[PDB]
Every structure is written in structure tokens, then in C-alpha cells.
Write a protein that binds this ligand. Structure first.
Ligand code: PE7
Ligand code: PE7
Ligand code: PE7
Ligand code: MN
Ligand code: MN
Ligand code: MN
Ligand code: MN
Ligand code: MN
Ligand code: MN
Ligand code: MN
Ligand code: MN
Lengths: 389, 375, 389, 389
């Protein structure tokens, strides 16, 4: 059945490319992807699948039932874009001012639509079901994966597989790693309340800028002391709002930060240590601290059994692309929510452009090699056919 | 021959109060004091004095020449009001909403006007000339005293004498102190330029919030290590503008600061030391620092001979303090001439919304200044 | 009467100088002044005074009782020397080890002995009692004043007067200031207990050098923020004992500091603020702190009423030297212990060498004009006869 | 062989254990391994190999020449012990008080000796040469690999293979990882020179304790800001020698620190950032800084091709034991010197006790499963035979 799969996919490469470009041209923001969601549901018209709409708001769950009893494998593609002004480059650059598919979600949707169509004409080659998940709202908390889980997107599902194109990794192969593969994320706001007063009488006041500044310096020990050197953690203060008047001792500063930890234990340690510094600042400087600490996407955990199965299957099929281990990746990803409800594997397709500058994700000049489309379909399809045989 | 003085004053007290209430009712901002400069000029109409209406921007210099040679004493009273919304509940409260005479400059003006008219009447009783300085724009930099000095005001003057009403000194005498008595001021703006980037890749960025935070931390050593314990210095960062985005390492912060020193040497040391740190931050964190350092009011030096001189002269007629926190642009006169600045008790909160004072200050002020003038 | 006193003291000026030079030739360290205390006691043999000698260690109190009811004035002179090798090269330079009268205590004792001798001959000319306090151990904490006081040196005393010769002030006047004139002192030891460990697993340790280092950084705010700009305070850490093995996270550090305040209120603010930072360190870094905070010399408070009276009394006596107000002085002085227990005045006699370069107190080249002896004796005697009229 | 090798090795397991236990009983410190070196030389007597004994001090190089054309492969076992008092309660525990084979270097030497004897018997079964490297001094810098390399140990050598038993990885598998597997090391001494002075006149001095403390504080940013979250690095200050007189402003402080980096670029970035802070302290505080920065063991780099090869070879043979990927490891390892010169693999054999408590390397209670001996020899031999086929 694999042989047939590959040539059908190769013969539809042009269609994937044409679809990516249309979607690239009409990107929509997270929680406002009205046209994209409608386009995806319309694609499946005339095709032999069940499409369930509005799973999350704009959640789309297309079921490909072979008609025969068996496992259920979910395959996931996200479709939201970002608030970025496109600077490509390209004839099919976004005509929706200020928004751009800067993370390859258009490409994820493109290959998945064509793969799903293809798997639908091959019900005679597998058992059980494929659940194709077209997910909105990946980019902005609370995200789409969460809302889709709450609406039962994973009812019946044994395993989840997802693919992300990587504009930073070499085209011509797919990449994998069991265990923790992408960082989880938290956000915090800290209000540091001292006491304002005239700038010539500091003894009468309690300087919030000094306290907040000492806090920023002490905070560096969370990463530098409190985490193991073999852990992966980040604590960034992106906003120190202490704007005031020249000669008035500042009464309050607002600090906002974000946190990444590659494992849940690392996230837990960071939260504990930032809370210790924040509470202790009150005793050290006599300020009042108001900490709001909001957990956000968990770290993405690639189930070791399933992920190794995926890499084993792909190496044993002998396709026109290589398969190899990779390092963990910096950004957070809401696929991590699937990966925490079911054993899952999130894998990567090399998408670095052949010629010209290589830009990272979310950059205005972001671009991928379009032959990542076919490789993604071939890879995911191969897994689907072996799994569910 | 100073009971005449004394008695003539005691008599005209109630005149001082009216005037004070009238000015308190119609207050005007620094550099916007058109009607008060007019009123002060008109008050002297009919009186044997010479009045300059623009020395300079709205500076009022009234000279009282005895017609005889030839020593020259300048006495100073300021007259600008403050941008605050009066909340005293007074029968003569500000009619100019948002503006208030909340430092007592209306009182300075009131008593001085009345002492000046009195001194015009005793031209026989003294030699040389008196220069009455009615000064606008004390409150808002650059002043104030500054322009006036360049524009004529000090020409031929050998000593300057001034008085402030202190709403927080009981109110039964006039307080003083020789030597450096009020701090001078400077301010600065520091741009700390690093390199912005996505929050998950700190190694590709240079965090300006971290550099700036470390700067504020090191800055504490200026007062705590670089100055003598016996010096008086203040280095305050009142503005740390590092407002940004969750999720983005901040590329630039803007720091604004406010410096005080009790001596001009202390101010220079603070400046050197802030510059050392600013420059050092660049080497230490790899940032670019753009420091704008603005000098402001000098420290107020009460000439020690002349100050005891006036205290002795006052003591020997008939019915010391700590240095004071505010900066005072009188310091500019005191930089160019041997001068003395003394205080008059007025306890009924300076620059406070509910600012009030004892009205016995007015009369005490005229008594002490007049006495000194005749010597 | 005054004319008597001045004349009498003038005729004895040679005796003052001879005693001073003798004492300068044989100086003794604080708490080791046996030979000097015996000389002081021996001086009073043959003289009509009451000499108490055990109050306290090497402390000598001599009472000159008019035999009539009245007030009691204490007058104080110290006699300890300093651990300094004299390189002044004077004929009468120290021939005792490596110790020198580098603070002019030989001059205080010398004029005081002769003044006391003179006052005993004038019991007719005053009422009540003079108490002469010959005090050891001024230079080294805890000091002699505190010890003499707990041994009843101020029993029944109404006021205390003291004089210090000043090598940096112009000879020819006496100097005074009401209120706080000299700084008080405190000292502290802070033990910072963390958790030691192998240098490459910071996450398993609690780094005491890091906590201690943050402490010292934060401590700068005591003087830079918590004190009024017009207060006079210093907080110095002279010892940060964090010596260990380069590759071991340090378990404990010992920090030692020294504090000065010109007012007792300044000293109290400093103590309160250092205690706040020590306990805030525990809460921020999870270390355990033991702060040992030892108050030492109070700041020297010159009673305004008494000091003004002294100044006035000297001005209105027809004396051959001026009297003028001075600035407060940097060094600490254990006379402050008396000034704390009784309304008191500490005044200065100008002693700067009229020719040649002037050296400060506690210097190897330290030298004083010997005219300061007579001036001191006349000044103190004038106050005595007037106060006890 | 290749089934001949395994059978021969299996029949010699008893011998492996006896050598291990003997060596365990008589451990010797780095640079002092006279008797262990002798023993190793004594083992090859009467065995058909070419023994060189003075390749650096205590360096033993054994060449097993097949006589035939082929490649050359060096295999490495280290033989130094540690300054640790044994507490295992084993019958063959160290009889050299205060010294213990607490890293399993006795086991490395044992399995290697038996393997090399076996490989000598099979010169007909391979082509090229085997260079067996018996290396002293691994534990104490500057260790043994460098001197041996300087003395021509890697001459003609194409690849280097080394094995470490791992007391905290499960018996019985062999573990591997391409790329950087073990951290490199550096150390530094910083002298921070200000200007000493009386503790209450800080404006006249330049406080080295203050500057030193601000330096430790700023140093935290090296790891917390200058390193990628995905890099592995440590900066520890183990020594802050600022002991002084509590009331003197300290003239000089000595700081000593320890650095780890998993890659050589990480180590280089750490050196750069510490030098930037050091040089920058001079500018900010006006102190003089003398930094001695000494690079020690480089990070251990496993050549990707050779280790993938080593892993493939092991898996395809049919050994009694499994083969799987490990994480990189905290400790330093002077094997890294060979790995920089020739394409190398350093792999691990699981040696955790199967019963009772698991203790790490350099622990007084360190203990290993003795099954790791046979497994190690079987692994290294299999690579030798397939590589030299
Ligand atoms: O003079 C400083 C200019 O800053 C522009 C930044 O571009 C220079 C190279 O920086 C690119 C990647 O950032 C590296 C992180 O900076 C770490 C230390 O920054 C030192 C400033 S050269
Ligand atoms: O606990 C305060 C902050 O420390 C955070 C760093 O934690 C490092 C690991 O902490 C372990 C906690 O144990 C506390 C001390 O235990 C001492 C006894 O342990 C001895 C065996 S290691
Ligand atoms: O500002 C950039 C250059 O600074 C000018 C010289 O600075 C030298 C470094 O000393 C800074 C520390 O100042 C401490 C005060 O010391 C005062 C006495 O020093 C005498 C010469 S070291
Ligand atoms: Mn994205
Ligand atoms: Mn994405
Ligand atoms: Mn004002
Ligand atoms: Mn004013
Ligand atoms: Mn002394
Ligand atoms: Mn003394
Ligand atoms: Mn070891
Ligand atoms: Mn080892």
C-alpha cells in the first residue's frame, strides 16, 4: 500500500503548493480564523470523510473511517497566523495587512488536506480510523488544542502525531526526539509597591525602582544557581514599568516576565524560586509585592515508545528523505496539550530555503522550501499506513 | 531710631495682610506671572522709588536711593505661584483654578512691599541705596534669579539678603544658619541601549533591563562609598522606563535621575562618579550609554561673616537651625555676592495642597530685614 | 578668684610641660597603663584631695571637696597611649617599645594634674566638690569611661567637662559645639549559612558567597536610601571571610562590619536597617543568618545649655585666648558615655604646631603646640570657679 | 572471529574479576601509580605483544599487530585511583588507607588486560593494528592523555575507543551519544585591587569587598543571560578571600572560581564573558583586576560517524546486552584530549548494582556490578574485529 501512497502523493504535489499559496495569501489571526476554517471544511466537500465542525470555536475534526475495526491515530495540523507584517518577497504574500503565516501553518494545512484526501481513497489499505485535526489558535494563549480537547477531539484516539516545518533545519530529511522536545511556558506580573515621596528626602520614602532593580539582579540566580546546568530554563523580564517624574521617588513599579522550562520539573522549580525571591523582597526592602503567576503551555513530551516507533517505521520504509535525531527546540507549542492527554510524537520536516538568507519563525522574512510539503505528507502517510495496518 | 522703623511697621501690619490675601487669590505660574508683576509695579506708584518693570523677563527691581553715597544692599522676595489645586477652604482662596501660592511667595511679596515703602520714607536715616528684588520664576528651572542676575539686577550691589517663610517652624522667631545651608541640584537622562530579541534566546540579545537594573544597584555606592560621611548627597532614579512586551528581551531603557549636593564640590564628585559608572556599564554589559547631564541650581552658600553679622544685628535689637531639604534659586545670587538667606517661622506642609501659615510671619520678616538695612 | 587662678596656673606652666614630656617619654597601651596610673596616684600624695584608686581598673577619681555644700562638677582627662612607633624624633620621644601618645593624652593628664593641684589650694574660692576623672583605655573598646561609670565615677556629679587638644586646629582658641560633636560606633558580625556542595551541581547547594555578595550590594542602600541626606552615617564591611576551594560551593561566610553615626538616632536607624537586610536575606535566598550587632561608643552629645554656658563663661572671663564654634568631628570618643549619663561638654583646645607641617591624630609624626596646656588649664579652671560659685 | 571472541571472553570472566579485585585492593593516586603501572607491564610478559613503557611518565602502550595491511585503532583504559577513604565494606576494599578506586578504573584495566590477551591470540582474525592505551593520571590535572599524545601514542592511529563503566546506569546495556558527551573545565583566579584606608573615610579609599561583591552579583548573568538555555555551563565562585580588619576598608580581595562547559564554544563564551565583567569592573569601580584564566580538560567530543558506526556494529552483532542512547554527562574526562586529535568514541557500560543502594562516582560507597567487565570486553572486541576486518 505504501508504494501506491507515495506516487499518489507525488502526483498531487502541485496541489499542495497551490493550496499553501492561497492560504499564505489569506492569513487570519488566532481566534479570528473565520475564512480559513470555512476553506478547510469546504475542501472536504465531495470527499468520503466525516467532517465535524465547531469542535473548538473553529475546531475541525475530519474522520476517515476505514469501515473496519482497529486503532485510531490522530494527525494534527494548525492553521492560525500571526500579527506580523510580511516582507517576503513573494507574489502570494499576505493581502491581510499586518498578519502573516510566519510559522508555516499554511504549509501544515496544505499537506494535511492533500494527505487526508489521499488516505480517504485508500480505506482498502488500513483498519480503524484516522482523525485529522485542523487546529486554530495555536499561537496565542489559551490556544486551540485545549479548547479542542474540551470538545472531545481525542475521543477514541490512541495516539497523536504532528509535524512542524522547520525553516532552520536542512531540507531533505525529517527530525525526531523522544521525551521533552519543546519548552513549556509561564507568565508573571509583579507589582512592587513602596512609598513615593519628594526626591530630596529618600529616608521618608521607600524606593520601588531600587527594590525592583535589586529584584532583577537577584532573579538571575534562578537560572544561574537554582537550576541544574543540564536543565533548560529561561527567566526574562521583558517589562520593567517604572516611568516617573525626575525628582519624585517612585512609589510603584510593574514588572512583567516570562518563563520557559524544557521539563515540567524545571517549570516547577522556576516558579518556586521566583515566588521565594518575590516574597523575600518584601522583607528585604519593606515593599509589598503582588505576584500573579500564570502557567501556560506545558513542555512538549514526545512519548518514547511511540516516537521511536515513528522513527523506526520511517527508516524501514525507505523514502526519498533521511530520518535522524535532533536537539530540543526553544519555542513553546500547544501540541504539548495533546502530548499530555495521549502518547504523542511531534516531529520536524526540514524546510530551510536552498538559496538566499535563512530566517527563523515569526520573522517578517520567514520562508520555507516548498518541498517540505511532499516530505511531510509522505512521512505522515507512511506512519498512518504502518500504524493501523 | 528704629522704633520709628519698628513702630511704623507694626502700624502698617494690617496692610500686609490684605495684600497677602489679594495675591493668594490671584496666583500665577512661573514664567506666566503677568498680573503680579503689574500689581507689584503699581503698588509703588506714588512712592519715592525707582521701578524697573523688565529686569529681565518680568523682573522687578525697585531701587531706593538715599541720594547719598554709596553702599548697596539688595533684599529679595519672590512672587511666582505653583501648579496645584488649592484645598485649604479659605476665604481668600485661589481664583485661578490649578494655580496656588503654596510656598508662601505671596507672603514674601506682601511684607516686602510694605517694608520697601517704609524704607522709602527714611531716606535721611541711611546712606547709599537699597535694591528691592521682586523675583519671578523661582519654582521652575532655570529660574528666576538666573536671568535677573544677567539682566541688570546685581550691578553695584555688594550684599544680598533674603527671607523664606517656613510653614513648619513654630512661628515666634526667625531662624538661620551660616555656611552651606541648602542643597544644589542636577538632573540626568541615561539611555541604556542593548539589543532586543525573542525572549527564548537571551544569548542572541543584550538585555537592557538587566544592564539598567545592575546600573541602579551600583549607583548606590556613589552616596554610600564615594562621598564623605560628612557630605550631604542624594542620587535618586525617579524614572526607569523599561515598559515592554512579555516575551521580548528589551532593547533600550530610559533612566532619569535627580541629584542633590550640599556643596559644589559634592555635586562635582557625584557627577564624576555617575559618569564613571555610566561609562563602566558599557564595558561591563556591552551596552551603549547616552548620558545627558544637566547642572541645575547651585548649593546655597550663606556667607559666614555676613550671616553672623545679620544674626548679631538682629539679636541686639529686640523682639540657629538645621540645613534645609528644598533647593532654592536664591543660591544664584549667593554665588555672585556675599549673601545671607534666613527663615521666618510660620506654623499656622510646603507645596502641600492644604498649605497655610501664621500671618505673624509677615511682620516679623519686615522687622528683621529693615533692621539689617539701616546698618 | 580668677586672677589668682590664672596667675597661679601661669607660674606653673613649666611644671605642666615637664610632666607632659615625661609622660610622652613613657607611654602605655589601653588596658595596660600601670606605670602611668601609679604616677597619677603618686602625684596626689602630699595634696589635700581624696584619691580613690579602684574605680575601676587603673581608674583614678580624685575629689576636691570645698568642705561646703554645693554642686558637683566632674572634669575629665584620659591617659592611654597608642600602638604607634614614634618617628617624630623629639628629645622626649617614646623609649617604650612600639607605643606613642599620638592623641595628646599626655597633655590632658599634664594640665589636669597641675589644675587639680591648684584648685585644691583654693577650697576657699568655691563651693561643693570637683571630681577629677583620670581615665584609662579611651582608645580601645569597650573603653574606660563605661567601666569607670559602672564603678560609680558619676555618683552625685551634676555636670561633666572634658577637653581634647586638637592637632589640626589653630593654637590660640578654645573650640566648642552644642549638640552632637563626635560620632558613635557600632560593630557587627554576620554569619551567612547556606549549603555547601560540589561546584558543578549548584542546584544541590545554597551558595553562601552569592548570598553574602548580594547582601553587601544591598547594604549600600542603608546609607544611600535609608538615612536622611543631612545625617552622617558610614557602614563599612572590612571583612568578608569566604575563603575556600575554588571548586566547592561555599557552605558559610562570615561578614564583619563597622558603623559610625553622628547621632544616636542615626545609629539606631542603621542597626534597624541592617537587621532588616539580614532577615530579608534569609527569606530571599533561604540561607540562615546570625547577626551579632554590638553597639559601642554613643555619639558624643554636648548638652546645649551647659555648652553655651561654658562658651559664655570663657568669653566673659578676661582670657588671653579666643573661643569659637567648630564643626562636628569624625572620630569617636568614649567621653560620650559620660555625656549620655549627665549633661556634659566636650571642648577642644587648638594645638596645631605653629611651625612645620601639621600631622593628624594617630600619626607617627603627630605633634602638638605646648601652649595648649596652659590654655586647657585656664579654660577648665575658669569654668570650675564660676560653676561652683 | 567473531563468535570465537565471545566464547573465549566468556571463559575468561573469572580472570577479569580477580584482576579487578586485586587492583581494587591496591589503588594508587594519579602521578603515583608505580605499582599499578608495574603490574600492567607484568601482565603482558609471555604474551605476544609489543610493550612500550615510557610513553610519558607511567604511560603504557601495547601494540597488537596482525602483520597484515589495515587500519589502526587505539583502545583506552585508565588506571589511577582517588584520594578517598573506602567505605564499601567489600572484602577486597583498598588496603591503601585514604586511596580508593572510586571511579571504576580498576574495572577498566581488568577487562582491558584480558581483552588484549585475547586479541593477541587472534592476530590471524583481524588486519592492521590494535594500540592498547593504558593511561595513568586521568583524575588530577593535567592528567595523562596529553603527555601520552605528546609522546606519540596516537601515531598511525585512525580512531580511538574508550569505555567507562557507569555506576548509575543500569546493567546490562552499553550507552552512547554522538557529539559532546562530557563537560570541559576551566578555572580562574581574580585579584581585585582597590585602595585601603580607615573604615570611616570611604571617600578616600576604594573598597575591594564592595567591588568584589558587585562582581559576583554581575557574574550570574554569564549563565543566566549569555548562555543559550540549551547550552550547559556552570560558573562557581568557591573562594572569596576578603578577610580583613572589620574597620579597615579592604585593599584587595582574591576570588577563585570553577567553570564547566559541555561544548568548547560554551567554554569560550564563558571565558569571554568573565573577562568582559572583569575588565568592566575596573572601569566601573576604578579597581585593578588581575585575572589568571586557565583552561583545563576540553569538552569530550564523540565523532558522529564513528560512534554511530560503533553503535550500529554493536546492535547488529548479537550480544547478550542492549545498546541505547544516553544523555550527556556532568563529569570531566581527559579522554577528551584523544577525542580532539583523532575521531573518537567514548561509550559507557551499565554498571549499577542490581541489589541495594546506587552510589555515584567518587563516593566512598561507590560500587559496580562486576557483569560490566565482560560486557565491556565483548563490546570493545566486537568493534575491534569488525573495524579491523
Ligand atoms: O556596540 C554594540 C553593538 O550592538 C549591536 C549588536 O550586534 C553585535 C553582535 O551581537 C549579535 C548577537 O548578540 C550577542 C549578544 O551580545 C552579548 C554581549 O553584547 C556585547 C555587545 S558587542
Ligand atoms: O532550602 C533553601 C534554598 O535552597 C535551595 C537549594 O536547594 C538545594 C538542595 O536543597 C536540599 C535541601 O536540604 C536542606 C539542607 O539539608 C542539609 C542536610 O543534607 C545533607 C545531605 S546532602
Ligand atoms: O572617571 C574615570 C577615571 O577616573 C579618574 C581616576 O580614578 C582613579 C581610580 O580611583 C577611583 C576610586 O576613587 C577612590 C577615591 O580615592 C581617592 C584617592 O585616590 C588617590 C589616587 S589612587
Ligand atoms: Mn509559531
Ligand atoms: Mn507553529
Ligand atoms: Mn518652593
Ligand atoms: Mn519658595
Ligand atoms: Mn584617639
Ligand atoms: Mn583622644
Ligand atoms: Mn573519575
Ligand atoms: Mn573515570
Amino acid at each position: 500500500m505504501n508504494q501506491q501512497l507515495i506516487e499518489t502523493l507525488k502526483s498531487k504535489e502541485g496541489k499542495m503548493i497551490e493550496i499553501r499559496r492561497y492560504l499564505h495569501q489569506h492569513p487570519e489571526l488566532s481566534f479570528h480564523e473565520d475564512e480559513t476554517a470555512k476553506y478547510i471544511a469546504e475542501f472536504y466537500k465531495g470527499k468520503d470523510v466525516e467532517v465535524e465542525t465547531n469542535v473548538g470555536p473553529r475546531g475541525i475534526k475530519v474522520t476517515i473511517d476505514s469501515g473496519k475495526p482497529g486503532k485510531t491515530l490522530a494527525i494534527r495540523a494548525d492553521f492560525d497566523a500571526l500579527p506580523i507584517t510580511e516582507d517576503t518577497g513573494l507574489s502570494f504574500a499576505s493581502q491581510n495587512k499586518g498578519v502573516m503565516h510566519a510559522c508555516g501553518h499554511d504549509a501544515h494545512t496544505a499537506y494535511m488536506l492533500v494527505l487526508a484526501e489521499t488516505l480517504a481513497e485508500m480505506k482498502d489499505s488500513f483498519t480503524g480510523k484516522v482523525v485529522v485535526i485542523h487546529q486554530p489558535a495555536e499561537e496565542v494563549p489559551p490556544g486551540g488544542a485545549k479548547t479542542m480537547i474540551e470538545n472531545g477531539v481525542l475521543d477514541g484516539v490512541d495516539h497523536v502525531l504532528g509535524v512542524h516545518v522547520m525553516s532552520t533545519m536542512k531540507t531533505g530529511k525529517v527530525y525526531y526526539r523522544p521525551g521533552y522536545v519543546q519548552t513549556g511556558r509561564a507568565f508573571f506580573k509583579l507589582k512592587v509597591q513602596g512609598k513615593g515621596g519628594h526626591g530630596s528626602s529618600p529616608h521618608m520614602a521607600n524606593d520601588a525602582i531600587v527594590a525592583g532593580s535589586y529584584f532583577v539582579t537577584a532573579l538571575q540566580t534562578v537560572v544561574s544557581r537554582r537550576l541544574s546546568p543540564f536543565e533548560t530554563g529561561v527567566v526574562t523580564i521583558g517589562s520593567f514599568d517604572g516611568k516617573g517624574q525626575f525628582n519624585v521617588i517612585k512609589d510603584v513599579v510593574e514588572i512583567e516576565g516570562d518563563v520557559r522550562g524544557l521539563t515540567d520539573a524545571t517549570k516547577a522549580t522556576i516558579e518556586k524560586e521566583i515566588k521565594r525571591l518575590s516574597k523575600g523582597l518584601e522583607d528585604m526592602y519593606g515593599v509589598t509585592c503582588t505576584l500573579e503567576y500564570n502557567d501556560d503551555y506545558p513542555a512538549l513530551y514526545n512519548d518514547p515508545e511511540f516516537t521511536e516507533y515513528v522513527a523506526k517505521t520511517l527508516k524501514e520504509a525507505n523514502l526519498d528523505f533521511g530520518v535522524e535525531m535532533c536537539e530540543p527546540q526553544p519555542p513553546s507549542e500547544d501540541f504539548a496539550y495533546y502530548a499530555k492527554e495521549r502518547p504523542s510524537a511531534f516531529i520536524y520536516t526540514g524546510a530551510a530555503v536552498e538559496n538566499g538568507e535563512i530566517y527563523p519563525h515569526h520573522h517578517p522574512k520567514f520562508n520555507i522550501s516548498e518541498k517540505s510539503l511532499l516530505i511531510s505528507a509522505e512521512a505522515v502517510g507512511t506512519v498512518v499506513l504502518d500504524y493501523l495496518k
